[PDB]
Amino acid sequence: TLPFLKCYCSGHCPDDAINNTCITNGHCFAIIEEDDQGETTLASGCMKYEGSDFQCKDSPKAQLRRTIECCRTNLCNQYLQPTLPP
Amino acid sequence: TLPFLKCYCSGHCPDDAINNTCITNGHCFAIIEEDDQGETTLASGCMKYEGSDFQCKDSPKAQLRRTIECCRTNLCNQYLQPTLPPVVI
Amino acid sequence: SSCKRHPLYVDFSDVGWNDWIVAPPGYHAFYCHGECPFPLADHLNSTNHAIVQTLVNSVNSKIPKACCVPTELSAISMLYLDENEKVVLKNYQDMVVEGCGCR
Amino acid sequence: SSCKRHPLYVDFSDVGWNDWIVAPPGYHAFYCHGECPFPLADHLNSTNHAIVQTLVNSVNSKIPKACCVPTELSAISMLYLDENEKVVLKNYQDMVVEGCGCR
């Protein structure tokens, strides 16, 4: 199915993103991730529909603390700021 | 095209080779090669037809000394023992 | 060792998905791993491009070798809990490695 | 640096094939390289298996990450010399990387 959704992207931008946006038939996401030192990063982008249930759900058994959040209205993820799991 | 050729294999056997043979639609090969440390090994197997011209020809500019030889009667690589390209001086 | 298929069983309770995947409890997914040497033998199912790249790497090691990846995959069916508590059947393509090769 | 296409021109002089390939003198082959991180973004055109493998790696790093490989290739034609020194035109499939993804 054709991409119908426009998303913000940062860190996961495609090689030919324009003005920091991307398109997809799946979801926009934002993710916060903590490395081994306690430092966090925020990133965002587009996720295609196939396999998106696995990725939006994520595994709670991941070794690194991180939270991904997905949404399905245009740009929804731009100011999305998910939080590490408590 | 269906595999029609049976080859000896050693070091490049597929996971389900039997008493040391493999089948292919391409060529049997034997290759002698000398590694980083001056250690030479001999290996052999089956090469599929697609892209076989490139692999049977090889590059004379390879960094390590090696000689591959291909052939196309059954098991023709059996006792194939190539000669290494001379040490460049 | 050279590119081949390796065992990998994905157990859903272990990865914490047993709350949304109701069946099966897990499945054999497998994975591909290992070297793509010169020459690429028949069972590696290589592309022309992987063969050329393998040769280039032998001349100029700044160009990487080809990579061992799935070259045939098969599907599994799963029952999952949807965004509503509804139990639904879904065919998931490309879930199981049936063969590996150098690409 | 995530999975993407990189430049690679294959010049037949530089691999020592000037004597058997009469045309062209070389071509742009490209190659694929770079990390397959979590999550796999849309432009990485990943399979379900690569997505699952990526999640498993994040749970236990003994399972490797997915690999950046060509997911679309195109053909080139070449003129060459055979055993007896005659010129044949041949179409070679899968010679040029058009797109990369995680598999």
Swiss-Prot record, chain A:
Q: Which cysteines are joined by disulfide bonds?
A: C7-C28, C9-C13, C22-C46, C56-C70, C71-C76
Question: Extracellular side: which ranges?
Answer: 1-86
Post-translational modifications: Glycosylated.
Quote the tissue specificity entry: Highly expressed in skeletal muscle.
- Which stretches of sequence are listed as region Mediates specificity for BMP ligand? 53-55
Glycosylation site positions: N19
Subcellular location per UniProt equals: Cell membrane; Cell surface
The annotated subunit structure for this chain is: Interacts with low affinity with GDF5; positively regulates chondrocyte differentiation. Interacts with BMP4. Interacts with SCUBE3. Interacts with TSC22D1/TSC-22. Interacts with BMP2; the interaction may induce HAMP expression. Interacts with BMP6. Interacts with heterodimers composed of BMP2 and BMP6 in vitro; the interaction may induce HAMP expression. Interacts with TGFBR3.
Which medical condition is this protein associated with? Answer: Juvenile polyposis syndrome: Autosomal dominant gastrointestinal hamartomatous polyposis syndrome in which patients are at risk for developing gastrointestinal cancers. The lesions are typified by a smooth histological appearance, predominant stroma, cystic spaces and lack of a smooth muscle core. Multiple juvenile polyps usually occur in a number of Mendelian disorders. Sometimes, these polyps occur without associated features as in JPS; here, polyps tend to occur in the large bowel and are associated with an increased risk of colon and other gastrointestinal cancers. Polyposis syndrome, mixed hereditary 2: A disease is characterized by atypical juvenile polyps, colonic adenomas, and colorectal carcinomas.
The record's similarity note reads: Belongs to the protein kinase superfamily. TKL Ser/Thr protein kinase family. TGFB receptor subfamily.
State its role: On ligand binding, forms a receptor complex consisting of two type II and two type I transmembrane serine/threonine kinases. Type II receptors phosphorylate and activate type I receptors which autophosphorylate, then bind and activate SMAD transcriptional regulators. Receptor for BMP2, BMP4, GDF5 and GDF6. Positively regulates chondrocyte differentiation through GDF5 interaction. Mediates induction of adipogenesis by GDF6. May promote the expression of HAMP, potentially via its interaction with BMP2.
List the protein's name. Bone morphogenetic protein receptor type-1A
- In the UniProt record, the gene name given for this protein reads BMPR1A
Whole sequence portion shown? 55 to 140 of 532
Swiss-Prot record, chains C, D:
Report disulfide bridges, numbered on this chain: C3-C68, C32-C100, C36-C102
**The organism sits in which domain of life?**
Eukaryota
Give compartment(s): Secreted
User: Glycosylation positions?
Assistant: N45
Tissues of expression: Particularly abundant in lung, spleen and colon and in low but significant levels in heart, brain, placenta, liver, skeletal muscle, kidney, pancreas, prostate, ovary and small intestine.
State the oligomer form and interacting partners: Homodimer; disulfide-linked. Interacts with SOSTDC1. Interacts with GREM2, RGMA, RGMB and RGMC. Interacts with ASPN. Interacts with MAFP5. Interacts with FBN1 (via N-terminal domain) and FBN2. Interacts with type I receptor BMPR1A. Interacts with type II receptor BMPR2. Interacts with SCUBE3. Interacts with TNFAIP6 (primarily via Link domain); this interaction is inhibited by hyaluronan. Interacts with ERFE. Interacts with BMPR1A/ALK3; the interaction may induce HAMP expression.
Role of this protein: Growth factor of the TGF-beta superfamily that plays essential roles in many developmental processes, including cardiogenesis, neurogenesis, and osteogenesis. Induces cartilage and bone formation. Initiates the canonical BMP signaling cascade by associating with type I receptor BMPR1A and type II receptor BMPR2. Once all three components are bound together in a complex at the cell surface, BMPR2 phosphorylates and activates BMPR1A. In turn, BMPR1A propagates signal by phosphorylating SMAD1/5/8 that travel to the nucleus and act as activators and repressors of transcription of target genes.
- Associated pathology: Brachydactyly A2: A form of brachydactyly. Brachydactyly defines a group of inherited malformations characterized by shortening of the digits due to abnormal development of the phalanges and/or the metacarpals. In brachydactyly type A2 shortening of the middle phalanges is confined to the index finger and the second toe, all other digits being more or less normal. Because of a rhomboid or triangular shape of the affected middle phalanx, the end of the second finger usually deviates radially. Short stature, facial dysmorphism, and skeletal anomalies with or without cardiac anomalies 1: An autosomal dominant disorder characterized by short stature, facial dysmorphism, skeletal anomalies, and variable cardiac defects. Distinctive facial features include midface retrusion, short upturned nose, long philtrum, high-arched or cleft palate, and variable degrees of micrognathia and dental crowding. Skeletal anomalies include patterning defects of the axial skeleton, characterized by 11 pairs of ribs and brachydactyly of the fifth ray.
Q: Which family does it belong to?
A: Belongs to the TGF-beta family.
Q: What is the protein name for this chain?
A: Bone morphogenetic protein 2
* Annotated source species: Homo sapiens
User: Top-down, what is the taxonomic lineage of the species of origin?
Assistant: Eukaryota, Metazoa, Chordata, Craniata, Vertebrata
Intact protein stretch covered? 294 to 396 of 396
